[PDB]
Amino acid sequence: GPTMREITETIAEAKKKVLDVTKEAQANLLTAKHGMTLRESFEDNVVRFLNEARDK
C-alpha cells in the first residue's frame, strides 16, 4: 500500500514535470538543442521523464 502511494506520486510528479515542459515550449522560451527541432527536443525531454518515471 504505501509503496503504491509512492508509485502513484512518482507518476504524478513526472506528469507535472511534463506539463511544465509543455507550457514552456508553448511560450517559445524553450531553446532548441543543437541539430534538433524545438519539437524534436521537446519530445526527447518528454519521452525521457515518462521513462525515468516508469523506471523509478
Binding site for another protein (CB under 8 A): 1, 4-5, 8, 11, 15, 18, 22, 25-30, 34-35, 37-39, 42, 46, 50
Q: Which residues contact 5 (CB under 8 A, 6 or more apart)?
A: none
Comparing CB distances to another protein, the nearer of 22 and 56 is 22
Whole-number minimum distance, CB 56 to another protein, in Å? 14
The span from the CA of 15 to the CA of 41, in Å, is 18
Whole-number minimum distance, CB 21 to another protein, in Å? 10
